Structures are given as C-alpha cells and as structure tokens.
CSV table of C-alpha atoms and ligand atoms in Angstrom, one decimal:
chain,number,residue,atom,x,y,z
A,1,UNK,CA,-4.4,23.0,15.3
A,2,UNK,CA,-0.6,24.7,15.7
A,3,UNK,CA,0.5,25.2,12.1
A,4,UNK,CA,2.9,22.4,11.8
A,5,UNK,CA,4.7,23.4,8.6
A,6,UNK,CA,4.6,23.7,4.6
A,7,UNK,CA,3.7,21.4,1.8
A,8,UNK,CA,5.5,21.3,-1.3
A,9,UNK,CA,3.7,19.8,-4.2
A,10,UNK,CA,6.3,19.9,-7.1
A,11,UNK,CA,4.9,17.6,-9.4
A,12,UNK,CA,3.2,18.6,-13.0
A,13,UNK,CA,0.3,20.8,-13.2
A,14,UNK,CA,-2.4,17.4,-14.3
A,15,UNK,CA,-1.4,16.2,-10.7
A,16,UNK,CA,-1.2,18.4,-8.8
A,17,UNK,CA,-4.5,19.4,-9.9
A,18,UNK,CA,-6.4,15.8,-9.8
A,19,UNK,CA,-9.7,15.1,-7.4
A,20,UNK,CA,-7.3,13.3,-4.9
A,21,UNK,CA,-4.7,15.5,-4.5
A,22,UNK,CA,-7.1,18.4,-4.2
A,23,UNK,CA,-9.3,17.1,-1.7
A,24,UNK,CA,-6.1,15.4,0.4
A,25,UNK,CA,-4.5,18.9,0.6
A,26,UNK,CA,-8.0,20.8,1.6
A,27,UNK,CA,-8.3,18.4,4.4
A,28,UNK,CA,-4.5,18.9,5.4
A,29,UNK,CA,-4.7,23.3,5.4
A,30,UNK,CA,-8.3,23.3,6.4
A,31,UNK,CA,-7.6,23.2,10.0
A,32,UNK,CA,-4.9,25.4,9.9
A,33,UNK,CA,-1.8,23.0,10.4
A,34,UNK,CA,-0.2,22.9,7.4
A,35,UNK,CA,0.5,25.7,4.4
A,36,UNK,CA,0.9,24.2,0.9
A,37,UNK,CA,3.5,25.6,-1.6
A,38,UNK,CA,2.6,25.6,-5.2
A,39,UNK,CA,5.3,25.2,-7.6
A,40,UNK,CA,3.7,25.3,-11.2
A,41,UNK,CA,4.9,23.7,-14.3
A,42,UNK,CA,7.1,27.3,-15.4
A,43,UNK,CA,8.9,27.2,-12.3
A,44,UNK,CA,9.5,23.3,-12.4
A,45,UNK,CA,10.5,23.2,-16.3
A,46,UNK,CA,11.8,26.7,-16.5
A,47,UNK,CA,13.4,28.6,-13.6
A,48,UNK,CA,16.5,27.1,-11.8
A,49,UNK,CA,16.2,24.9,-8.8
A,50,UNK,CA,17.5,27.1,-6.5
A,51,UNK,CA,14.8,29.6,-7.1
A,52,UNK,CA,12.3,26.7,-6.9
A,53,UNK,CA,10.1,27.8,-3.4
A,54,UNK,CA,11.3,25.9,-0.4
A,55,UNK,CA,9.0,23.6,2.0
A,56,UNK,CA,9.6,21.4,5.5
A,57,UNK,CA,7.3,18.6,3.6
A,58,UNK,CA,8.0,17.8,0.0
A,59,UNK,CA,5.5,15.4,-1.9
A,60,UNK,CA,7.1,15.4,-5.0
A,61,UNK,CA,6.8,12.3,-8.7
A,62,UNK,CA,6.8,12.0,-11.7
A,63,UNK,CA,5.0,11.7,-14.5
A,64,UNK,CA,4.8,12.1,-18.3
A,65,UNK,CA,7.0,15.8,-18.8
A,66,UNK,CA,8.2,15.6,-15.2
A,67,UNK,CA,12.3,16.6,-15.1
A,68,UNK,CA,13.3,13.9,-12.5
A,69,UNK,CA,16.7,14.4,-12.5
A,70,UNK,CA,16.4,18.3,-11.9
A,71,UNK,CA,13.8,17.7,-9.0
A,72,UNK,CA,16.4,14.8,-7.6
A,73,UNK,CA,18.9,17.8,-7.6
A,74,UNK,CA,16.7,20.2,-5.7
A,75,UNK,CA,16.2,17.9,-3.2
A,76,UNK,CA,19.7,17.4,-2.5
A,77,UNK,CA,20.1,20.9,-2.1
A,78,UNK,CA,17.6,21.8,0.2
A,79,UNK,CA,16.6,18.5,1.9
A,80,UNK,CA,13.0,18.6,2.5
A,81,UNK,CA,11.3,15.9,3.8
A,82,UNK,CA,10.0,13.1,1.7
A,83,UNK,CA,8.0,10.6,1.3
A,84,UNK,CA,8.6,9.0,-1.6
A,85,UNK,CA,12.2,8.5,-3.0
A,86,UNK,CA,12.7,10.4,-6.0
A,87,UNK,CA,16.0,8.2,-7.2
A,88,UNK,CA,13.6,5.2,-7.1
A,89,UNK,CA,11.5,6.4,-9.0
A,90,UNK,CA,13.6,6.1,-12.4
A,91,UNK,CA,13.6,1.9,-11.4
A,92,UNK,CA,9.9,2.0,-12.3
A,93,UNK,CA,10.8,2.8,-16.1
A,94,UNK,CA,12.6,-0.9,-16.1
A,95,UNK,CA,10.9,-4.0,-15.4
A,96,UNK,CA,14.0,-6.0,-14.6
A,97,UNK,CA,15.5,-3.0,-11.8
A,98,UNK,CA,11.6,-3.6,-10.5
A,99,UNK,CA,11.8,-7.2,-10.2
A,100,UNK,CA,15.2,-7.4,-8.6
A,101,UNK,CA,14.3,-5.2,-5.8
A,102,UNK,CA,11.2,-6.7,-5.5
A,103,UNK,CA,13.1,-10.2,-4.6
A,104,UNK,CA,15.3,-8.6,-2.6
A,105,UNK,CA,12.4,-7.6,-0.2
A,106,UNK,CA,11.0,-11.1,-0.5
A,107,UNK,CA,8.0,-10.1,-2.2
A,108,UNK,CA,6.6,-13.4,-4.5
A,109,UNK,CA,6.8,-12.7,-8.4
A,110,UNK,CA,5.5,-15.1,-11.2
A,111,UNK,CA,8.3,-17.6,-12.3
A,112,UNK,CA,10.0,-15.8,-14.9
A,113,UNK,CA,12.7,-15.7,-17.5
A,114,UNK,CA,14.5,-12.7,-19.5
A,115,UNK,CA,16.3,-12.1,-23.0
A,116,UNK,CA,18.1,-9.0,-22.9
A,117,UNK,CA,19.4,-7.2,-26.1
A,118,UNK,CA,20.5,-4.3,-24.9
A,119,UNK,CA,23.1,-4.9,-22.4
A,120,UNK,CA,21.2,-5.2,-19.3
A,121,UNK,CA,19.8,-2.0,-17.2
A,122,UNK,CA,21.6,0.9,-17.1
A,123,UNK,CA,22.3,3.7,-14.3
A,124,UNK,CA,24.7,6.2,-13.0
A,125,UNK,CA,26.6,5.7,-9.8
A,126,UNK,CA,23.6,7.9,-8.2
A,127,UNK,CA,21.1,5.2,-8.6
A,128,UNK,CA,23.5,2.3,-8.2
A,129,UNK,CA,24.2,3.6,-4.7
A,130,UNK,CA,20.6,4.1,-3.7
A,131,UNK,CA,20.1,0.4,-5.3
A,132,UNK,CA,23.0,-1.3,-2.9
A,133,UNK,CA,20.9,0.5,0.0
A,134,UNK,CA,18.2,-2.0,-1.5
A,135,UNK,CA,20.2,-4.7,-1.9
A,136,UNK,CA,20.7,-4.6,-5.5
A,137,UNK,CA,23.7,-4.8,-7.7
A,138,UNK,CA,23.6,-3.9,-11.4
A,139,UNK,CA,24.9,-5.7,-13.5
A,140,UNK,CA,26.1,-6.0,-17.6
A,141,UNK,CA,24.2,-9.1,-19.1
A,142,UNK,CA,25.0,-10.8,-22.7
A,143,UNK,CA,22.4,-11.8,-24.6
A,144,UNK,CA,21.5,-15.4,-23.4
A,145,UNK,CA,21.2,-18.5,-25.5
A,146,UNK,CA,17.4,-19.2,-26.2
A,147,UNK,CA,15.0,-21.3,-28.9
A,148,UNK,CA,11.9,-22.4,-28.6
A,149,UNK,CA,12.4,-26.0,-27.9
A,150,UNK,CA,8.8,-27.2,-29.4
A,151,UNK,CA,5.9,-24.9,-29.7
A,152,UNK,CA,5.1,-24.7,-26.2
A,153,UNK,CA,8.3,-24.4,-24.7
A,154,UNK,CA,11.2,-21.5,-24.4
A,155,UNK,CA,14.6,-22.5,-23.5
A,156,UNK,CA,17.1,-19.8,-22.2
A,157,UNK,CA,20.2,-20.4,-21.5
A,158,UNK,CA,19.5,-23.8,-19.9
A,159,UNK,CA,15.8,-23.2,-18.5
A,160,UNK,CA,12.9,-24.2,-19.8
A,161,UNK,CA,9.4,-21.9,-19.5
A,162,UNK,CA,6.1,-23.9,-21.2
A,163,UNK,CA,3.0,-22.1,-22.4
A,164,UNK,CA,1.2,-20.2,-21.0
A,165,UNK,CA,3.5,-17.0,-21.1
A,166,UNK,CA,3.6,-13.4,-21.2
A,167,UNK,CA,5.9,-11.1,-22.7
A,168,UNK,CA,6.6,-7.9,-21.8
A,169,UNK,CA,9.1,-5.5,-22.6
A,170,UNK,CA,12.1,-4.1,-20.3
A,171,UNK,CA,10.6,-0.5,-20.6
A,172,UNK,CA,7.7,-0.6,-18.3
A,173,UNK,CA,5.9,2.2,-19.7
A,174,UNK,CA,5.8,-0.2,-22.9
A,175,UNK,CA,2.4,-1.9,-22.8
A,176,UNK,CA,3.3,-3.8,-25.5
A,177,UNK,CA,2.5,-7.3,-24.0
A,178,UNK,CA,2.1,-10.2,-25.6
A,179,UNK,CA,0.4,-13.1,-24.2
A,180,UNK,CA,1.3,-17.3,-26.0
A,181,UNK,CA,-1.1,-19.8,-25.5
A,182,UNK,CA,-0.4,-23.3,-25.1
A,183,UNK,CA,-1.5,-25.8,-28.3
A,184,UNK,CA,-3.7,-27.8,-26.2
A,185,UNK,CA,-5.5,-24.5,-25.5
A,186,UNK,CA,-6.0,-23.6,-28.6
A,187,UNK,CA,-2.3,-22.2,-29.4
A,188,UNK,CA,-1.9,-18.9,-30.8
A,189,UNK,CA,-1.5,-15.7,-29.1
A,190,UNK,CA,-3.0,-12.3,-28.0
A,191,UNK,CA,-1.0,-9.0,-28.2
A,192,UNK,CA,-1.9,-6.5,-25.7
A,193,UNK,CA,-2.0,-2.6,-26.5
A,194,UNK,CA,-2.6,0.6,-25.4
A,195,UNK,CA,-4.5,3.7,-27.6
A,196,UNK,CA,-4.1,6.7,-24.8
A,197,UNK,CA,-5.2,5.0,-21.8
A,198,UNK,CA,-7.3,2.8,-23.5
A,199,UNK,CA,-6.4,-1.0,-23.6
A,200,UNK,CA,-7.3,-3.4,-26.4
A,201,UNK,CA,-6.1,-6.7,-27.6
A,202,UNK,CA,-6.2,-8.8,-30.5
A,203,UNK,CA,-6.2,-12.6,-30.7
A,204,UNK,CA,-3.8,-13.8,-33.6
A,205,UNK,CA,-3.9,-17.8,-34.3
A,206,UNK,CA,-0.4,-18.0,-35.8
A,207,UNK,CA,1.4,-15.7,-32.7
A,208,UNK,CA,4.1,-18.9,-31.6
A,209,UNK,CA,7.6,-17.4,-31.2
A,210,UNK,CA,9.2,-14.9,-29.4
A,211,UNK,CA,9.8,-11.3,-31.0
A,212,UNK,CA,13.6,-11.3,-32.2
A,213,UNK,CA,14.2,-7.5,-31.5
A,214,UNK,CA,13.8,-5.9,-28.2
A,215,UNK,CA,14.9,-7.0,-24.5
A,216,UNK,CA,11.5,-8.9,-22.5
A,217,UNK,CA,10.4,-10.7,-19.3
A,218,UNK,CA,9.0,-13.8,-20.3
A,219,UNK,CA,6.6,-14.7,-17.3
A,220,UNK,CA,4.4,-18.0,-16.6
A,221,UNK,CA,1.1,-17.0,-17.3
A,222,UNK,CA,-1.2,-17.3,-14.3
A,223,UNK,CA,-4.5,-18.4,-13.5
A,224,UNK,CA,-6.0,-15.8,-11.7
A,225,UNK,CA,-9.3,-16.0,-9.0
A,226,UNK,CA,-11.9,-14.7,-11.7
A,227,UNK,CA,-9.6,-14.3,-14.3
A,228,UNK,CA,-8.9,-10.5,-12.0
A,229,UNK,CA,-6.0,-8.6,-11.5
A,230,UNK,CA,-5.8,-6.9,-8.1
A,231,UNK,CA,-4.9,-2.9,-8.2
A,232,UNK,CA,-3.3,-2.0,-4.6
A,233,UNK,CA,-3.0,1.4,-3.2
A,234,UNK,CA,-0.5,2.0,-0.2
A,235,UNK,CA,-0.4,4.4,2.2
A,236,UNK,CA,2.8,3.8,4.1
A,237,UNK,CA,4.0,0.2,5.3
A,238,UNK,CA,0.0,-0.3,7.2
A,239,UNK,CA,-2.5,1.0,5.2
A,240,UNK,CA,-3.5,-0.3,2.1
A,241,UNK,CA,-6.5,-0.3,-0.6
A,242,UNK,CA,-7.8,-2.8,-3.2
A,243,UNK,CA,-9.8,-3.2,-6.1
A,244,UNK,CA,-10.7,-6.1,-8.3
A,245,UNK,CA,-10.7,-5.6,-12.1
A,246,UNK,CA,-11.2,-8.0,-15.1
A,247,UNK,CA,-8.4,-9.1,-17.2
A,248,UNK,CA,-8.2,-9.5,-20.5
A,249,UNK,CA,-5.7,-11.7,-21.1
A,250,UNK,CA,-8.0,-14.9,-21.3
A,251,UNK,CA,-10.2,-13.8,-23.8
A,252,UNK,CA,-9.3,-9.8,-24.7
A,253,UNK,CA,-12.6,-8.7,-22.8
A,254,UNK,CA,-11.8,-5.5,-20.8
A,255,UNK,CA,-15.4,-4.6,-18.8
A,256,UNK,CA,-15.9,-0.5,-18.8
A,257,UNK,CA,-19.2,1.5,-17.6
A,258,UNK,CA,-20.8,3.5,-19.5
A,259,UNK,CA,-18.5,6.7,-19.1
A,260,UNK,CA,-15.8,4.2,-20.4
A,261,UNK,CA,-14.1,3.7,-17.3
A,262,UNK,CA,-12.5,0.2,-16.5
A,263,UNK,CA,-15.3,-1.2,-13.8
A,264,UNK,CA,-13.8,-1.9,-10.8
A,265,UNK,CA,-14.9,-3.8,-7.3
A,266,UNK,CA,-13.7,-3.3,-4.0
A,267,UNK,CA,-12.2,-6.2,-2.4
A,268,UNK,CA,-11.1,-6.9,1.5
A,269,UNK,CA,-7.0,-7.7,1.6
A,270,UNK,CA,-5.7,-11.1,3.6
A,271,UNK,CA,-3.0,-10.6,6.5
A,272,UNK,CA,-0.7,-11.8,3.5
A,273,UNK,CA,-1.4,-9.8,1.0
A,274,UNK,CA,-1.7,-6.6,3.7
A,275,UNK,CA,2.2,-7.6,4.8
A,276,UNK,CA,3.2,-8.0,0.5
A,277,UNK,CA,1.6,-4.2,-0.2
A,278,UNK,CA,4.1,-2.9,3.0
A,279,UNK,CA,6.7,-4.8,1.3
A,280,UNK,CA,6.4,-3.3,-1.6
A,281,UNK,CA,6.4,-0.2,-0.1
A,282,UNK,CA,9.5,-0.2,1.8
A,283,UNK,CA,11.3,-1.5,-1.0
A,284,UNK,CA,10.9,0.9,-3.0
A,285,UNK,CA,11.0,3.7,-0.4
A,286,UNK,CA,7.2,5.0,-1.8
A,287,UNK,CA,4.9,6.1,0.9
A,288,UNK,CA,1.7,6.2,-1.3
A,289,UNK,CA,2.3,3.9,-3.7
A,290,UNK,CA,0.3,1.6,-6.3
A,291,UNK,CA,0.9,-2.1,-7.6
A,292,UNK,CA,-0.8,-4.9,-9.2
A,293,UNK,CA,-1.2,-8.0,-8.0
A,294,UNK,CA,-2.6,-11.2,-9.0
A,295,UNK,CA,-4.6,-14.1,-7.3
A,296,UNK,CA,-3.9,-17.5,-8.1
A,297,UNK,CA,-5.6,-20.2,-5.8
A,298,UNK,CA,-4.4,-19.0,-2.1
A,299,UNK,CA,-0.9,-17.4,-3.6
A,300,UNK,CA,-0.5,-13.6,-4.2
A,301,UNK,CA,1.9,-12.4,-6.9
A,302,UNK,CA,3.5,-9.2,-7.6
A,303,UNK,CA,3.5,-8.1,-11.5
A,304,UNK,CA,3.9,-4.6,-11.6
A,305,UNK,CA,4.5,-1.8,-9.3
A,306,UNK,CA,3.5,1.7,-10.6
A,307,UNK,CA,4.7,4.3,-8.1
A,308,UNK,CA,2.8,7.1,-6.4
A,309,UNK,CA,-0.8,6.5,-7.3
A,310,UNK,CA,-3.8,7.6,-5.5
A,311,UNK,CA,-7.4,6.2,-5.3
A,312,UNK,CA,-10.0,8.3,-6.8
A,313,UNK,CA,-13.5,9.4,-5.4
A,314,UNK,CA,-13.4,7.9,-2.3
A,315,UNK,CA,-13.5,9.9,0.7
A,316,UNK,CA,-12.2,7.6,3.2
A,317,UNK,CA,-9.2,7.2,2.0
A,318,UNK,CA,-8.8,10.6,1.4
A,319,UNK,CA,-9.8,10.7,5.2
A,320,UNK,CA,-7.2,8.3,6.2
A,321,UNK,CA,-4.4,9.5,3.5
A,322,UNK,CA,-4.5,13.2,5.0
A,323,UNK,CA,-4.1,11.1,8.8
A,324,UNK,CA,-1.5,10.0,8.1
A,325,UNK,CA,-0.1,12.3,5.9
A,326,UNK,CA,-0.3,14.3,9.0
A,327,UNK,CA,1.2,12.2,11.6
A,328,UNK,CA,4.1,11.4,9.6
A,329,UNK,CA,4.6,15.3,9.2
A,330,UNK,CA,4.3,15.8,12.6
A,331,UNK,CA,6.4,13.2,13.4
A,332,UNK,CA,9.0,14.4,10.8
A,333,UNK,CA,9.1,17.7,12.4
A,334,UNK,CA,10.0,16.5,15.7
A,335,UNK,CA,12.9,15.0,14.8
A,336,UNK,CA,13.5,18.4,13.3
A,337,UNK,CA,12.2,20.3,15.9
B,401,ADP,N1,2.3,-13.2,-15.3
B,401,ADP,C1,1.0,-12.8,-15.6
B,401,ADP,N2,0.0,-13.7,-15.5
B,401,ADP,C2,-1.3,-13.3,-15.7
B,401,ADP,N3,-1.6,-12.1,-16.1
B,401,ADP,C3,-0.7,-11.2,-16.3
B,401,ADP,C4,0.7,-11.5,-16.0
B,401,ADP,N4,1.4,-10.4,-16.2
B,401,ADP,C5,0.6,-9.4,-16.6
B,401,ADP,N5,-0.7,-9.9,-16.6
B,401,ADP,C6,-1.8,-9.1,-17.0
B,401,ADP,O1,-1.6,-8.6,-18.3
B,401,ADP,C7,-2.4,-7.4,-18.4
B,401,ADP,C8,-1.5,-6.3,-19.1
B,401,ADP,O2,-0.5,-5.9,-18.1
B,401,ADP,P1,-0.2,-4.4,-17.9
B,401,ADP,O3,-0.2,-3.6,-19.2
B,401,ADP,O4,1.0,-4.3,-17.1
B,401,ADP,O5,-1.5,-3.9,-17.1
B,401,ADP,P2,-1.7,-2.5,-16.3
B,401,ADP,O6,-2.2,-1.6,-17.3
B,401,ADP,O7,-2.8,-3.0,-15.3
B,401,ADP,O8,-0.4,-2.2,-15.7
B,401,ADP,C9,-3.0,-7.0,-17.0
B,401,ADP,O9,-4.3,-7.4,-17.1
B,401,ADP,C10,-2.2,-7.9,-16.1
B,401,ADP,O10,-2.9,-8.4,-14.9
C-alpha cells in the first residue's frame, strides 16, 4: 500500500528486539506502508532528546534502564503520536495510584485495605494533572491505626479484614507478597518471591502478623476457578487475549514445562470480562496493555495491571496486533493529514 508514515520504537534494546515486536513490525513495513525508526539504547541514554530521530507514530515504554522522564520530555517536544501514555506509565510503579484509577473506571478490585508508612504516593504536578484527567486526586495519608484484633482478623482504622489475606507492598515491582491463612485452615502463612523471573514460595507455620516496616495493600484473599490467575493482553479498548495459569498461593505449586517456562492454557473471555480488559485500557490510556485477573465463582477481579505487554509466539495476534496497529495509524494520520 501508499506509505502511510514512520514508526518510532524508542524503547530499550531487549524490547525492541523481542519475537513480538520483531514479527509485529515486519508485518507493519512489509507491504510498504509504514518505515520504522530505530532509536538504540546510546541514543536513548546518551544523546539529548532533541537529537533523538523523529517519527508520525511513536510506540514508546518502559522497562528496567528505560529514562521515562527524558522520553516523557521528548514527547512533549515533538508530539508524535501515541499509543500508550508515557506519564501513566510511572502509576504502574505504585499499587495504590493503580488501584485508585482502576475504581475510578469502575473496574471490580478484591476488597481491600492499606497501611501506609510513607506518606502516601508521591508525584509532581506533571502526573497529578494527567491523574485529575483520570479522575484521581492524590492525596497525603497518616499512618492509620491498625492491630490484629485476633489472629484472623486486621483492624485498620475502624475496618476489619479476616483471613484469608494477601500482602503486598506499595512498590509494585516488589514481589514480595505474603499470603495469611486463616486458623481453621491450618493458620500460618506463605511468603511469595522472586529469584530473576523465577517465582518460589515458602510455607512458614508461625507467619500471623503483619510486617511492621514498609507501606502494603492488604487484600481478601480469593478463591479462584482452579485455583488460576487469568493473564490478559489488550489491544485497544476491543481486542483482547487470555491465558490461564496456576497459582501458587494455595499450596506454593507453580507448574513450568520442561524449558522452565510457567505452562499456560488459552482461555475464551466472557462479554464481562471483554468490557473489564477495555476498561482497563482506557484508564490507563495503554493501547496494548497487560493485566491479571482473577476468577472467583461468576465475578472477575482486577489485581494487577502491568503495562505494555505483548503475547509471545502466537501469530494471530501478531496478525491482528499489526491490524490494528495499522488502522489506528491510519486513522491518526488523517486527522493529521
Ligand atoms: N487478592 C488475591 N487473591 C488471590 N490471589 C492473589 C491475590 N492477589 C494476588 N494474588 C496472586 O498472588 C500471586 C503473586 O502475585 P504477583 O507477584 O502480583 O504475580 P504476577 O507475577 O503474576 O504479577 C499471583 O499468583 C496472583 O494471582
């Protein structure tokens, strides 16, 4: 077809260079209609932003090394297209920013409540702005008043949580979760962990009370269809993805393949849960964008939301992800051009 414009990938070198984004953007040149602009870690950590190479279509986040707040500043300058809000991104580093917006897009969350040490969220006036387009304030919080009531039961400030729980921390690239069972279940705990990439947990009979340092989201722990978690994958506000995987945080059993890759089973969405992954979409202004969700009994819930996120090895929705990579292009360019 008529070349419709350029593609800028600025994004680090390990992602711009994965299977997805190499086969997307071979199906979006090989006709002809589009030109893709490399911009290379040097020039993204190194040279000044208004020497970084221009674009009419920016696909552009971060990850680990990634200087957001210099890409945030070349897109102000030279206004690209984009797909996924770069501003928005930073949310995704605190679970509580995530969990407000996600309410404020009526998308259902677990039953939850927080102890804060640290003051509640922070941001400058950049991100508070691009929150109140979102409908979210930010705001200074004290540390509540909280005890465990009885074994089973957290009290904070007023409100009462019972066991089953999980605890997270504020920083949601902490994976630091610990889970507290209820006594009639057998009590004790499981603490969650990471060992780069790889998950593990560790069942510990005497975990009962809170930790006493840190800021956390205490949510009700859920029972969920087949004790799974549900990884979602969106393409825009009307295309989305889904796998199954096991959870461990029944019984600590994570279920890999023999390469040592989490197993994972491709499951159909419901109407509902198709409407919740355009939700979470539009809320936080990511065009391709993943999130977890869990399946309790009829009811979806939203637990996590991870940002932009491509599936892997699967060449229909790379089919479908350079579609309508390219109509929203061509789209974009009209209202240009
Ligand atoms: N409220 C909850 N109820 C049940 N399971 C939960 C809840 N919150 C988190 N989980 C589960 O805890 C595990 C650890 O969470 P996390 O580290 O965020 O996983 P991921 O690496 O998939 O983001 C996941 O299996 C997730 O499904």
């Amino acid at each position: 077809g008529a070349k419709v414009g350029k593609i800028g990938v600025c994004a680090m070198d390990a992602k711009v260079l994965s299977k997805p984004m190499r086969h997307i953007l071979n199906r979006l040149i090989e006709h002809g209609e589009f030109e893709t602009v490399i911009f290379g870690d040097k020039v993204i950590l190194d040279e000044r932003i208004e020497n970084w190479p221009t674009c009419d279509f920016l696909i552009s986040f971060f990850s680990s090394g990634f200087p957001l707040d210099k890409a945030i500043k070349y897109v102000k300058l030279r206004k690209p297209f984009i797909i996924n809000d770069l501003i928005m991104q930073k949310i995704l580093w605190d679970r509580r920013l995530c969990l407000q917006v996600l309410e404020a897009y009526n998308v259902p969350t677990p039953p939850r409540l927080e102890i804060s040490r640290d003051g509640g969220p922070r941001a400058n006036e950049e991100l508070r702005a691009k929150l109140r387009e979102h409908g979210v304030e930010v705001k200074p919080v004290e540390e509540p008043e909280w005890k465990m009531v009885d074994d089973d039961t957290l009290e904070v400030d007023g409100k009462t949580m019972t066991k089953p729980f999980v605890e997270k921390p504020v920083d949601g690239e902490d994976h630091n979760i610990y889970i507290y069972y209820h006594s009639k279940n057998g009590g004790g705990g499981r603490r969650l962990f990471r060992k780069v990439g790889n998950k593990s947990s560790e069942f510990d009979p005497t975990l009962v009370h809170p930790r006493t340092e840190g800021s956390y989201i205490y949510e009700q722990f859920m029972d969920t269809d087949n004790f799974e978690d549900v990884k979602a994958y969106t393409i825009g506000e009307n295309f989305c993805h889904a796998e199954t995987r096991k959870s461990p945080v029944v019984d600590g059993i994570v279920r890999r393949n023999t390469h040592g890759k989490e197993v994972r089973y491709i499951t159909e969405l419901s109407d509902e849960e198709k409407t919740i992954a355009g939700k979470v979409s539009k809320a936080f202004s990511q065009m391709i964008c993943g999130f977890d969700l869990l399946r309790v009994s009829g009811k979806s819930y939203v637990i996590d939301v991870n940002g932009f996120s491509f599936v892997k090895d699967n060449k229909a929705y790379y089919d479908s992800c350079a579609n309508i990579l390219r109509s929203t292009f061509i789209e974009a360019k009209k209202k240009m051009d």
